[model samples]
Target: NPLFSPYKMGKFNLSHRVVLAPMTRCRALNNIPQAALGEYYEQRATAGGFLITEGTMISPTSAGFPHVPGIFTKEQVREWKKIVDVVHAKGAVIFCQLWHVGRASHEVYQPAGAAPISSTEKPISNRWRILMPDGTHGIYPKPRAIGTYEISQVVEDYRRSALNAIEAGFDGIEIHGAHGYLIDQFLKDGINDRTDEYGGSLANRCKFITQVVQAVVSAIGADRVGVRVSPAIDHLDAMDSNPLSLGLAVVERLNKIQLHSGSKLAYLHVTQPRSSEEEEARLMRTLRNAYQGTFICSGGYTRELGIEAVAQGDADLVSYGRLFISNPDLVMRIKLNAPLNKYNRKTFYTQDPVVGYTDYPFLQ
Candidate 1:
């Protein structure tokens, strides 16, 4: 299987190119990973395989959803250490995803009863609803435009959290720059209406992300960092007038970061745009050509497709979200071409920690 081929990502040696995509399963109670969370990751751990944990909040103000794990606090770090130990025991390398929801969050989830902070003060289109504390859906409220002075603190939050992830025993950290998160708010033109160095021109639009990449890379070696982005994705209305240009600018910036800092990133994980495979391939070809490090293509990939992607020069690795969710032994099943367990969407974000999580069956 081409997907089973070995590859060296920075200092980490991988036995296969199949990676577990960073998914938010909403199982953490009080933003702390517990025993059940460890069991879930343990099932997905394939010796020498790579897995990215659920998007973990970087600060109290970073909360976008209830029950999602956080990395900043002492209790959160201690619990995650337990989960990381189990994954390491199975010989799989795990990276914690540092996340911030930006305007995608509601005031209910904000710290000190304040509104969410973002590059723009606008709310996400009423089309999307936020999950309320009581499990009901609520319309998103307008965010307070994050001040220029406040930008450094937001960047600091990312740096502090990245350090905390290392303390939690993660092999590395994946900054969640995709899916309408904090960084994406600045990268995409539609969401960011700032009138400072962080807005307007392409270079300005990219400044926040560059600062974040540099800061996190500064805290942890560049060898241990990976970034995830979705330029073509308008998730939560983080749309770009030109996705191709946006993606290109981001890839080029990441490449330059290594040269400027004298360190290279472990990989760059990209989520496919909401388009056909042909459209996706074209976009992939462009970005793949521009990036200088290990490239990962994710978002709606299948076993055979992953093999094909790796066989071709489309990507160095493939990250699976849904496929890996229902099939704990995802790598083994792909090796044998075995069937996979169907995932239950109804239970994907429930408060229950195990039903649709650790309950997935391993191949007998």
Candidate 2:
């Protein structure tokens, strides 16, 4: 079947269509990805197409949780190198999801007691919780406004982080421009009310993202750099009055850049809108028309749904999130049509290794 067939992403030929969705384990050791993390990933690498690391904060100020990893410092890159080496030895390709929390961070996570940065000065209105200094989870804090110069610094920071990802031995880099993060904050109309180049019309909103992408592409090959976006998603208080139009504009511009640069983007990964199947289909159709590269769709996908979507040509890849949490050998399960293990929602962000992070058994 097509799902089991080999396909090229960047310079690597993946063994299967099962892409391991990135999940936050909050298991890093002081800005460094621990060695045990490598074993966790390598254990899960069985004919899987790819494994993307959890969203790694690009800089110190971007860190929201105590132990969540960052890719800025040399120590961090060196630590991730060990994990990358392990994944490669297992014959699996891996990518690093470069991230910035923006206003999604707590004030305690900020530098010099500075405020969290965002496209707007608005406080996050979502009900999501964060890990506190006392190791307790609670509601997120109010974010600080980002000045014009700080925005420029953030762009450079992303560029620097992409360079670090390449140095860290990642096969490619995935810009986390989705899920109401820094990039999404700039892209979403509801959150972005600036009069600057990064605000106003959809084109203007995409300006910052485009510039960052261009910088990263220049740092690493454009073929090795891809981005993820969640259009029409209200996740973490993210919204655009006209998300479809926003996505169309973004994809259209990305298509042009791909052509001009003569680079094959690894994939244009889309998180499906929170809507009905028919609505999702319509939005994906529009995206397929606009984007000229491989497309991957994510969001509550089951084995049947993912395979069917690929079989019907809706997406080239199906990204599984929670399923990968409990089923490390998700590819084999899907191939054999075996049952999946259910994950515990309560322990999704726990720091313990066995309970939530990597204790799931393979199907017999």
Candidate 3:
């Protein structure tokens, strides 16, 4: 009952209860993925289930670090197609995560030393390092604010990225609207200082996200698209005062969009709050009321907590991050109540893919 169950999300017919949460492996080839990356995904495929790809930047300017792939370039598209082919060959459904770092990116990753794009011109206080073009790590610099016109460009970039993912053989696309990225920056009132139509009010703040969803659904029908949003998630210095209100309004609007009309949403993939369990449960209850689709909960969930969440109807599925890294055949192991492999922290983001990428052994 836990590992194998049929569920409808948006338009896709998912075959199992397990889902591979999108995690950044950071092991692409020339910033473009190699065939080995294709093999990596194929190796992780279950008998039948869902597997979300790591966040791929929508454009060169959108790429925050070295080694992550982009979908905009023709060569990169070709490279991804190879990976998608391998995954499809294994019979597992796949979705690509379209992403942008916003202020999370540093100047060193920008083109010709351009500043990262953000909702506000404020300098990011979070000290972070990014790999320069020369392959050396450099301290991140403050990003420049995005203007109204540039916002249009970013929206188009997301739409184009979704189309490119379809062309590369993905079954669906998931917009990376969470984790304090470009879209999330706009959603969070604290990060977005815009005084125009894209900021201030909750509806206006969600305008960017609505536009992006509309564009992607236009490119690839709404049934083939989904979105990931974490309203209260404070990763990378992201915070929201009224995420409950904002989340409610945003999902209400999303529910009205035709592109999202019959789409399964795959899942909401909520972020667990660091505060009291009561606060977390309250937030989940609020979010559950807002979104009427399949919900998936993430963020340091134990086996028992995940099972309980799914059983209680608070969530339709649960996603494992580091656990999936440690156990490639996670569903089977979870089903048999077997021990999991230890996660190798040293190679989580290293340039080498040979270590933690696909080398995790399955339980016999």
Candidate 4:
């Protein structure tokens, strides 16, 4: 079957086409990955497929939540090495998802109770509750606009984080340029109101992401780097006036960068929004055509839908999030045509032990 076949994704020859989409479980403490995180990933590395870690903060100021891992610290890097070693031992290819929440954060998560930074000073409301310094959950506050000079510092942070991932023994790195994060804030014009070179027009709005990609690619080979983008997602108060055009422009620049560098990216992971089957197929086709290399599509996909997508050539791979949370043996279950366990939404982000974290049962 198409889903069970081997495929070359840049440097790695993946055993299958199912990718474990990065899902934040809030299990880290003090921005450091714990042993449970290693067990969590090792449990799902049975298929020798691809796995992307949860959105790991690229810098201390880039943090937005409690217990999410960071790649910028030495202690965090040491802990991540354990996880990477275990996953590689099982023959799975893993990529660390480099992230910065930007305005989608609370002041409590920032340093010295400072305001979170973004492309503009716009505030986001009705988002995820943040774990305050007082140990209580509260609403996210408005973030300050990042200074033009500081933007270069953020780019350097990405470069350093990419280098950190390599030192931590990660097989590759995936830039989190999606889901209304720092890079996404710069990509969309709605939130990025700055008239500087980093905002306004589509090309300018994409400048930050382009710079980040170039920096990361330079630190790590372009073939070992991937990017994720969500054009239709409006979460975290991030919306664009023209999503299709924005997506096309971003991919066009990525393709040009690949040509200029004489290297190809591992893959372009696009998060599909909730839409009708016909509409989703059309959007996937458009995205696949825009990028010349491997394309991975994600968002609420089923085993049958994933199989069909790969079979029909809409996507080279399919990424599963919630399903992988409850089914550590997800690829095995699909291969054996076995039933899957339903995931518990309540324990999705709790700080409890492994009730819904890594205790998911596999076939006996």
Candidate 5:
């Protein structure tokens, strides 16, 4: 089957086209990856498959949720090494997804009681629970706009995080440019109202991300860098007036950068927006035509749908999110056409020990 075939990605040859999508489980402690995460990831590390970690904060101020992990600290690097070691032991390749929440963050996660930062002073409509001044958890405060000088520092933060990820023994790094995060915040026009060079026309709005990608590519080779983008996803107030033009422009810029660097990017991962089958098909066609390298399509997908996607050449790989959570032996189950274990949604984000994390039964 096309999904089970070997494929070349960057310098590594993957055993299969099934990739484990990054999902936030909020299991970290004090923004550091723990040993339990090692066991959790090792269980799902099928030989030759690809796995991208959850959205890991790139700096202290980049955090948006409680218990999310970070890559900026030495402790974080040491702990993530445990995960990387175990996953490599299983012969699977892993990438750390570097992230910054921008306005999605709250004061509870910021330093010295400062508000979260973004491209503009405007706050998002969505609210998150944060620790109150009196030690109570409540809604988050409004965010402040990031200054022009601070934007360069933010880009540096990403470059530093990418270097740290390399030190942590990751096979590669994936920039979390999707799902209305900091990069997405800067890419979308509705949220970015800046008058500076970072915001204005499409070229200006894309300037920050281009700089970020270049920084990361410079730190690590272009062959070891991948970027995720969600042009159609409007979640967390992320939307563009023209998604096709914006998405294609981003891909074109990335392709040009790769050409200039004398190496192709690891991959281009795109999140399929919620839409009809016909619409999704049309969008994927456009994306496949624009992006010259490996394309990974994610969102809701079943085994049949995933197989169809790769078979039809819409994607070079298919990413499974929740399915991999409950079935650590997901590749085996799919290969044998066996029944899959159902995932319990309640324990997904809870601070549970190992019930829904690593205790899922595998084929005996």
Candidate 6:
């Protein structure tokens, strides 16, 4: 099966095309990795398999969700290394996902209750609520616009976190440039109303992420880097008038970075919108033609769809989210067409480590 076909991504060789997509379990209490986190990965690890960790905070101010892990502190790094060691012991290639929520947060999630920073001062629509520390929901607050001078410091945060991931024994790192987070807040016109170099024209709108990508690339080398983007997603109201152009614009800059550095990023993972399947198809197809390195696709994919995507040359790798969560042996089930476990979405973001986190039974 194409899904079980071997592929090479940068310095790592994957025995199959299935990848464990980064999922937020909210099991890491107090923004630190817990011991059960390692057991969670150990259950899913396959020799030469690929897995990306959950949304990990890049800095203290980068958090939007409660219990998300981070790598910015020495103690946190030490904990992550232990998690990485178990994943590596199973011979899986793991990548740390660095995240910053920007305006997707409430003031309570910030350091000293400082306002969340973004490219614009506007607040996210009250249509979506943020999960609070005590499991209650709150509306997003208006964020302070980050000055151009401050952008460099944020970029530096990414660089330092990239180094921290390596020190924690990860095979690589994936910049969370997707899902209406800090980076997407700059990429989309619906949210980014800046008139400076960080916004406006396509080049200007992409400048901030460009600096970040370049900074992380220069710090850790492009081969050890991967970027996730959701230009068409429009999640959390991060909409763009033209998703196709935005996707291509991002591809243009990423390709340029490759040419300038004489190296390629490990991969570019893009999310597909189910409602816009036809449109998303064209977007992914165009991106497949435009991007230079390995390409990974995620969002609501099934075993058949994943196999077809890989067989049809649509994606080099396909990542599974909820499927992997409920069925730790996702690869084996896909390979043998075995009965799959149904995921309980209600327990996805709970605090308990065993109930919905590592309690998924493997193939017996």
Candidate 3 lDDT (Cα, 0 to 1):
0.78
Ranked candidates (lDDT, high to low): 6, 1, 4, 5, 2, 3
**Which residue pairs come into collision in candidate 2?**
none
- Error (Å) of candidate 6 at residue 62 is 0.3
The better candidate by TM-score, 2 or 4, is 4
lDDT per residue (tens digit) for residues 1-364 in model 6: 9988889898899999899999989888898999989999989999999999998999999999888999999899999999999999999999999999999998788889999999999999888999988778999999999998888899999999999999999988999999899999999999999988888999999998889999999998999999999988978998899988998999999999999999999999998888866777888989878999899999999999998899989999999999999999998999999999999998889999899888888888
lDDT of each: 0.91, 0.82, 0.78, 0.89, 0.87, 0.92
Instruction: State residue 63's C-alpha deviation in candidate 5, in Å.
Output: 1.0
Worst 10 residues of 3 by lDDT: 258-267
lDDT of 2 by residue, 1-364 (tens): 6688777776768777888877777778566788657767887876436888888988888877667789899989899999988888888888899889888878677878677778887777747776775577766666766776888788889889989999988988888889888889989988898898778988899988888788888888888887899886887888889889999888987887788788977888888865587888889868876788888888889888887878888888888888988888888888988888898887776666566766788776
Candidate 3 residues 137-179, lDDT tens each? 6665677887789999998999898989999999888888887
Q: Residue 336: error of model 2 in Å?
A: 0.9
- The C-alpha RMSD in Å for every predicted model, in order, reads 0.9, 1.7, 2.1, 1.5, 2.1, 0.8
> Best to worst by TM-score, what's the order?
6, 1, 4, 5, 2, 3
Between candidates 2 and 3, the lDDT winner = 2
**Model 2 stretches with alpha carbons more than 4 Å out:** 126-129, 133-139
> How do all models score by TM-score?
0.98, 0.95, 0.93, 0.97, 0.95, 0.99
Error of 3 at 19 (Å): 0.7
Q: How far in Å is the alpha carbon of 216 misplaced in model 4?
A: 0.4
Clashing pairs in 1: none
Model 4 lDDT tens row, 114-135? 9999998888766556655445
How many collisions per candidate?
0, 0, 4, 0, 0, 0
Clashing pairs in 3: 9-264, 10-263, 10-264, 222-259
